[PDB]
Amino acid sequence: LLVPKLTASVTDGAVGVTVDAPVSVTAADGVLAAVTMVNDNGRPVAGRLSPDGLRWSTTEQLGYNRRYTLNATALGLGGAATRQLTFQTSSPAHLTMPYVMPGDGEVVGVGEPVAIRFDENIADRGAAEKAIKITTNPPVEGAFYWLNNREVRWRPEHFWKPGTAVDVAVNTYGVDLGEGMFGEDNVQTHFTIGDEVIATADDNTKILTVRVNGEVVKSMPTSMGKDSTPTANGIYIVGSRYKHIIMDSSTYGVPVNSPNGYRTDVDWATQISYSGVFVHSAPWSVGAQGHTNTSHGCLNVSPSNAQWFYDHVKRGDIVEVVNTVGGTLPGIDGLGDWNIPWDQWRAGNAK
Ligand SMILES: *C(=O)[C@@H]([C@@H]1N=C(C(=O)O)[C@H](SC)[C@@H]1C)[C@@H](C)O
Ligand code: NA
């Protein structure tokens, strides 16, 4: 007859035990008759034993900087076995919280990347990427790319196919993200891709044409950036929408009191770059719209066309600007991800 054997997922005296996984105990040639896990000051840890009595596991989040003591007894025909193990979990120098976009349960356009923004700089980008689990249905190849030291993006080679489910699990709790930095918690979001909405602003015609699944549904006269401050060419991703908003140039680095500084309240504004490009109402330039460029870079349209855009275009839809005397929108703008060539995006920049 064999004496029961106890096996635990941790070892007695271990330090730096990571807290991204549960602690378990398994019995062999016998069953678990008693399992308790207690922190430094005696508080019991929630756990559950399997019906067949063979495996116990913690069922709640284990804490950073804890010393836990596990006590287990196994009983079998051949006798008894009891063990006591004490171990210490990870002690972070710092915690960072991730924030994910887009919103949970949202429907977005075919240009929307998965966005994970940490509230601290990440020293080990690879460890962050590894901790982020993206599911797509139908499955599609995609890749991570960092816009800066805190925010990473994931997208496919081409615009999403309408009807695609996207699930994002950021499993950073218990994960060492470099230089003693650990995830403050996990976060999860799920979203779905809607209709293909692509609006093209052609500087040769000064028209903003809105296509939904390939069909023209709207043609808006526009006035883009004057030659001195032109609208950059390229692919812009639609972000937030505002019934009205005070445009403050200092938000985008430009002192209000300075030469092309400004602080103006505007109607029906749809943001399409972090650098401050909006589609918005411009009653002052309705005469110029469709004829000459007169703005600071924004896409001036009529009050009714700005409101139409507000009502009918959603986060993640696409605005393409072409044929202007500007350069190309920076790939790392914040809403310019599609201007990065796929070979470069796919290669990433985690190192
Ligand atoms: C965009 O060009 C700016 C925005 N558009 C303006 C315009 O005149 O077209 C006004 S300046 C009076 C407003 C500030 C900015 C947000 O980029
Ligand atoms: Na879209």
Coordinates of C-alpha atoms and ligand atoms in Angstrom, one line a residue:
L1 CA 0.0 0.0 0.0
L2 CA 1.2 3.4 -1.0
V3 CA 1.4 6.5 1.2
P4 CA -0.5 9.5 -0.3
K5 CA 1.6 12.1 -2.1
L6 CA 1.1 15.9 -2.0
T7 CA 2.2 18.1 -4.8
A8 CA 1.8 21.9 -4.8
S9 CA 2.2 24.6 -7.5
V10 CA 4.6 26.5 -5.2
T11 CA 7.6 25.3 -3.2
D12 CA 8.2 25.9 0.5
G13 CA 10.5 28.9 1.0
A14 CA 10.0 30.3 -2.5
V15 CA 10.2 34.1 -3.1
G16 CA 8.9 36.1 -6.1
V17 CA 6.0 33.8 -6.6
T18 CA 3.9 35.3 -9.4
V19 CA 0.4 36.2 -8.8
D20 CA -0.8 35.9 -12.5
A21 CA -1.9 32.3 -11.7
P22 CA -3.8 30.4 -9.0
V23 CA -2.0 28.3 -6.3
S24 CA -3.0 24.7 -6.4
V25 CA -2.3 21.4 -4.5
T26 CA -2.8 17.9 -5.9
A27 CA -3.0 14.6 -4.0
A28 CA -1.9 11.2 -5.5
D29 CA -2.7 7.7 -4.1
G30 CA -5.2 9.4 -1.8
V31 CA -7.4 12.5 -1.6
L32 CA -7.3 16.0 -0.1
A33 CA -8.9 16.0 3.4
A34 CA -7.8 19.5 4.4
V35 CA -6.3 22.4 2.6
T36 CA -6.0 25.9 4.0
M37 CA -4.0 28.9 2.8
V38 CA -3.5 31.9 5.0
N39 CA -1.8 35.2 4.6
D40 CA 0.7 36.8 7.1
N41 CA -2.0 37.8 9.6
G42 CA -4.1 34.7 9.4
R43 CA -6.8 35.6 6.9
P44 CA -7.9 32.6 4.9
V45 CA -7.6 32.6 1.1
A46 CA -10.7 31.6 -0.8
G47 CA -10.3 28.2 -2.4
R48 CA -12.2 25.3 -3.9
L49 CA -11.6 21.5 -3.9
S50 CA -12.6 19.5 -6.9
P51 CA -15.5 17.0 -6.5
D52 CA -13.1 13.9 -6.8
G53 CA -11.0 15.4 -3.9
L54 CA -7.8 15.4 -6.0
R55 CA -7.2 19.1 -6.6
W56 CA -7.6 22.2 -4.6
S57 CA -7.1 25.7 -6.0
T58 CA -7.3 29.3 -4.9
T59 CA -10.3 31.1 -6.4
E60 CA -9.6 34.7 -5.7
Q61 CA -6.9 37.1 -6.7
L62 CA -3.7 36.7 -4.7
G63 CA -1.9 39.8 -3.5
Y64 CA 1.4 41.4 -4.1
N65 CA 3.8 41.5 -1.1
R66 CA 2.2 38.6 0.7
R67 CA 3.7 35.7 2.6
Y68 CA 1.2 32.9 2.4
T69 CA 1.2 29.6 4.3
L70 CA -0.4 26.6 2.8
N71 CA -1.3 23.6 4.9
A72 CA -2.5 20.4 3.3
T73 CA -3.4 16.8 4.4
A74 CA -4.0 13.9 2.0
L75 CA -5.6 10.6 3.2
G76 CA -5.6 7.3 1.4
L77 CA -5.8 3.6 2.2
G78 CA -2.1 3.5 2.7
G79 CA -2.1 6.3 5.4
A80 CA -1.7 10.0 5.6
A81 CA 0.6 12.8 4.4
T82 CA 0.7 16.4 5.6
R83 CA 2.8 19.3 4.4
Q84 CA 3.2 23.0 5.3
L85 CA 4.6 25.5 2.8
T86 CA 5.3 29.2 3.1
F87 CA 6.2 31.4 0.2
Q88 CA 6.3 35.1 -0.7
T89 CA 4.7 36.7 -3.8
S90 CA 6.1 39.3 -6.1
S91 CA 7.1 42.6 -4.6
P92 CA 6.5 45.3 -7.2
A93 CA 8.5 48.6 -7.3
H94 CA 5.6 50.0 -9.2
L95 CA 2.1 49.2 -10.5
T96 CA 0.7 50.2 -13.9
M97 CA -3.0 50.2 -15.0
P98 CA -3.9 49.5 -18.6
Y99 CA -6.8 51.3 -20.3
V100 CA -8.3 49.8 -23.4
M101 CA -10.1 51.2 -26.4
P102 CA -12.6 50.9 -27.9
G103 CA -15.4 50.5 -25.4
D104 CA -16.9 47.2 -24.3
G105 CA -19.8 46.1 -26.5
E106 CA -19.2 49.0 -28.9
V107 CA -19.7 48.7 -32.7
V108 CA -16.9 50.6 -34.5
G109 CA -15.7 51.2 -38.1
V110 CA -13.3 49.1 -40.1
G111 CA -10.3 51.3 -39.2
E112 CA -10.4 50.9 -35.5
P113 CA -7.3 49.4 -33.9
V114 CA -7.2 47.7 -30.6
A115 CA -5.6 50.2 -28.2
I116 CA -4.0 49.4 -24.9
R117 CA -2.6 52.5 -23.0
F118 CA -0.7 52.0 -19.8
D119 CA -0.5 54.8 -17.2
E120 CA 3.3 54.3 -16.9
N121 CA 6.2 53.8 -19.3
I122 CA 6.7 50.1 -20.1
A123 CA 10.2 48.8 -19.9
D124 CA 9.6 45.4 -21.3
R125 CA 7.2 45.8 -24.3
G126 CA 7.5 42.1 -25.2
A127 CA 6.2 41.1 -21.8
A128 CA 3.2 43.4 -22.3
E129 CA 2.4 42.1 -25.8
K130 CA 2.7 38.5 -24.5
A131 CA 0.2 39.3 -21.8
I132 CA -2.4 40.6 -24.3
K133 CA -4.7 38.0 -25.8
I134 CA -6.6 39.0 -29.0
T135 CA -9.3 36.8 -30.4
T136 CA -10.8 37.6 -33.8
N137 CA -13.8 36.0 -35.5
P138 CA -13.4 35.4 -38.4
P139 CA -9.8 35.0 -37.4
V140 CA -7.4 37.4 -39.1
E141 CA -3.6 38.0 -38.9
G142 CA -2.7 41.1 -36.9
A143 CA 0.2 42.5 -35.0
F144 CA 1.3 44.9 -32.2
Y145 CA 3.0 48.3 -32.7
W146 CA 3.9 50.9 -30.1
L147 CA 2.9 54.5 -30.7
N148 CA 4.9 55.7 -27.7
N149 CA 6.3 54.3 -24.4
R150 CA 2.8 53.8 -22.9
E151 CA 0.4 52.9 -25.7
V152 CA 0.4 49.8 -27.9
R153 CA -1.9 49.2 -30.9
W154 CA -3.0 45.9 -32.6
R155 CA -4.5 45.8 -36.1
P156 CA -4.7 43.6 -39.2
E157 CA -2.9 44.3 -42.5
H158 CA -6.1 45.7 -44.1
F159 CA -9.2 47.3 -42.8
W160 CA -11.4 45.0 -40.8
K161 CA -14.1 43.0 -42.4
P162 CA -17.6 44.1 -41.3
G163 CA -19.2 41.7 -38.9
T164 CA -15.9 40.7 -37.2
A165 CA -15.9 40.1 -33.4
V166 CA -12.9 41.3 -31.6
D167 CA -12.1 40.2 -28.0
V168 CA -9.2 41.8 -26.0
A169 CA -8.0 40.3 -22.7
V170 CA -5.2 42.3 -21.1
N171 CA -3.8 39.8 -18.6
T172 CA -1.3 42.0 -16.9
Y173 CA -2.0 41.3 -13.2
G174 CA 0.9 39.5 -11.7
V175 CA 3.0 40.2 -14.8
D176 CA 6.5 41.8 -14.5
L177 CA 6.5 44.5 -17.2
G178 CA 10.2 45.3 -16.6
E179 CA 12.2 47.2 -13.9
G180 CA 9.9 46.0 -11.1
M181 CA 6.8 47.3 -12.8
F182 CA 3.8 45.0 -12.4
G183 CA 0.2 45.2 -13.8
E184 CA -2.3 46.7 -11.3
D185 CA -5.1 44.6 -12.7
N186 CA -6.5 42.8 -15.7
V187 CA -8.8 44.4 -18.2
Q188 CA -11.1 43.0 -20.8
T189 CA -13.1 44.4 -23.7
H190 CA -15.0 43.1 -26.6
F191 CA -16.2 45.0 -29.7
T192 CA -17.6 44.4 -33.2
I193 CA -16.8 45.8 -36.6
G194 CA -19.8 47.5 -38.4
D195 CA -20.4 48.9 -41.9
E196 CA -17.5 49.9 -44.1
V197 CA -17.6 53.8 -44.0
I198 CA -14.8 55.5 -45.9
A199 CA -14.9 59.3 -46.6
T200 CA -12.5 60.7 -49.1
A201 CA -11.4 64.3 -49.3
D202 CA -9.9 65.1 -52.7
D203 CA -8.0 68.4 -52.8
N204 CA -8.6 68.5 -56.6
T205 CA -12.3 68.7 -56.2
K206 CA -12.6 70.0 -52.6
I207 CA -15.4 67.5 -52.0
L208 CA -15.6 65.1 -49.0
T209 CA -17.4 62.0 -50.4
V210 CA -18.8 59.5 -47.9
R211 CA -19.1 55.9 -49.1
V212 CA -20.9 53.2 -47.1
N213 CA -20.0 49.7 -48.2
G214 CA -18.8 51.1 -51.5
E215 CA -21.8 53.3 -52.3
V216 CA -21.8 57.2 -52.3
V217 CA -24.3 58.4 -49.8
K218 CA -23.0 62.0 -49.3
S219 CA -20.9 64.6 -51.1
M220 CA -19.8 67.5 -48.9
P221 CA -18.2 70.7 -50.2
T222 CA -15.2 71.3 -48.0
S223 CA -12.5 73.8 -47.3
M224 CA -9.3 72.2 -46.0
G225 CA -6.0 73.7 -44.9
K226 CA -4.6 76.8 -46.6
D227 CA -1.3 76.3 -48.4
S228 CA 0.6 77.6 -45.4
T229 CA -1.1 75.1 -43.0
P230 CA -2.2 72.3 -45.4
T231 CA -4.2 69.2 -44.5
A232 CA -1.8 66.2 -44.5
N233 CA -2.6 63.5 -47.0
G234 CA -3.3 60.0 -45.8
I235 CA -5.6 57.7 -43.8
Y236 CA -7.2 59.1 -40.7
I237 CA -9.2 57.1 -38.2
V238 CA -12.4 58.7 -36.8
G239 CA -12.2 59.2 -33.1
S240 CA -14.6 61.1 -30.8
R241 CA -17.6 63.3 -31.8
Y242 CA -18.8 66.5 -30.2
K243 CA -22.1 68.4 -30.6
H244 CA -19.9 71.4 -29.8
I245 CA -16.3 71.8 -28.6
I246 CA -13.9 74.6 -27.7
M247 CA -10.9 74.2 -30.0
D248 CA -7.8 75.2 -28.0
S249 CA -4.5 75.4 -30.0
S250 CA -2.5 74.9 -26.8
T251 CA -4.0 71.4 -26.5
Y252 CA -2.0 70.7 -29.6
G253 CA 1.1 72.6 -28.5
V254 CA 0.3 76.0 -30.1
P255 CA 0.1 79.0 -27.7
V256 CA -3.3 80.7 -28.1
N257 CA -1.8 84.2 -28.0
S258 CA 0.8 83.2 -30.6
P259 CA 0.6 83.6 -34.5
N260 CA -1.6 80.7 -35.6
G261 CA -2.9 80.0 -32.1
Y262 CA -6.6 80.0 -31.6
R263 CA -9.4 79.3 -29.1
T264 CA -12.8 78.9 -30.8
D265 CA -16.0 77.2 -30.1
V266 CA -17.3 75.1 -33.0
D267 CA -20.3 73.0 -33.8
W268 CA -20.6 69.3 -34.8
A269 CA -17.0 68.3 -34.6
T270 CA -15.7 64.9 -35.4
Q271 CA -12.0 64.3 -34.5
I272 CA -9.8 62.5 -37.0
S273 CA -6.3 63.1 -35.6
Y274 CA -4.6 63.7 -32.3
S275 CA -2.8 66.6 -33.9
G276 CA -6.2 68.4 -34.0
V277 CA -7.7 67.7 -37.4
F278 CA -11.5 67.8 -37.2
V279 CA -14.5 67.6 -39.5
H280 CA -16.7 70.4 -38.2
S281 CA -19.3 73.1 -38.9
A282 CA -17.8 76.2 -40.5
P283 CA -20.6 78.7 -41.4
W284 CA -18.0 81.4 -42.0
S285 CA -16.5 79.6 -45.0
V286 CA -19.5 78.1 -46.7
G287 CA -18.6 80.4 -49.6
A288 CA -15.1 78.8 -49.9
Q289 CA -16.2 75.2 -49.3
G290 CA -15.8 73.3 -52.6
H291 CA -13.6 76.1 -54.1
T292 CA -10.6 77.2 -52.1
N293 CA -8.7 76.0 -48.9
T294 CA -9.0 78.4 -46.0
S295 CA -8.6 76.5 -42.7
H296 CA -5.8 75.7 -40.3
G297 CA -5.9 72.0 -41.4
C298 CA -9.5 71.1 -40.4
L299 CA -12.1 69.9 -42.8
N300 CA -14.5 72.8 -42.9
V301 CA -18.0 71.8 -44.1
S302 CA -21.5 73.3 -43.8
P303 CA -23.5 73.2 -40.6
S304 CA -25.9 70.6 -41.9
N305 CA -23.1 68.5 -43.4
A306 CA -21.1 68.6 -40.2
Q307 CA -24.2 67.4 -38.2
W308 CA -24.8 64.7 -40.9
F309 CA -21.2 63.5 -40.4
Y310 CA -21.8 63.6 -36.6
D311 CA -24.9 61.4 -36.9
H312 CA -23.7 59.0 -39.6
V313 CA -20.0 58.4 -39.1
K314 CA -18.8 56.4 -36.0
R315 CA -15.5 55.9 -34.1
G316 CA -13.2 53.8 -36.3
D317 CA -14.6 54.8 -39.7
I318 CA -12.1 56.1 -42.1
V319 CA -11.3 59.5 -43.6
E320 CA -8.8 59.5 -46.5
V321 CA -7.3 62.9 -47.6
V322 CA -5.6 63.0 -51.0
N323 CA -3.9 65.4 -53.4
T324 CA -3.2 68.2 -51.0
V325 CA 0.1 70.1 -50.8
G326 CA 0.7 68.7 -47.3
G327 CA 2.9 65.7 -46.4
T328 CA 1.5 62.5 -45.1
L329 CA -0.1 62.1 -41.6
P330 CA 2.4 60.7 -39.1
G331 CA 1.9 57.0 -38.6
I332 CA 2.2 57.5 -34.8
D333 CA -0.2 60.5 -34.6
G334 CA -2.7 58.6 -32.5
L335 CA -5.3 58.1 -35.4
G336 CA -2.7 57.6 -38.2
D337 CA -1.9 53.9 -37.7
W338 CA -2.9 52.9 -41.3
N339 CA -0.1 55.1 -42.8
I340 CA 2.5 52.8 -41.4
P341 CA 3.5 50.2 -44.1
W342 CA 2.3 46.7 -43.1
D343 CA 5.9 45.3 -43.3
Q344 CA 7.0 47.8 -40.7
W345 CA 3.9 47.5 -38.5
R346 CA 4.1 43.7 -38.5
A347 CA 7.8 43.7 -37.6
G348 CA 6.8 45.8 -34.6
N349 CA 9.0 47.8 -32.2
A350 CA 9.0 45.8 -28.9
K351 CA 12.8 45.9 -28.7
Ligands
LIG1 C1 -8.7 73.3 -37.8 O1 -8.2 73.7 -38.9 C2 -8.8 74.1 -36.5 C3 -10.2 74.6 -36.4 N1 -10.7 75.0 -37.8 C4 -10.7 76.3 -37.9 C5 -11.0 76.9 -39.2 O2 -11.0 78.2 -39.3 O3 -11.2 76.1 -40.2 C6 -10.9 77.0 -36.6 S1 -9.7 78.4 -36.6 C7 -10.8 79.8 -36.6 C8 -10.6 75.9 -35.6 C9 -9.8 76.4 -34.5 C10 -8.0 73.4 -35.4 C11 -8.9 72.7 -34.3 O4 -7.2 72.4 -36.1
NA2 NA -16.2 51.7 -41.2

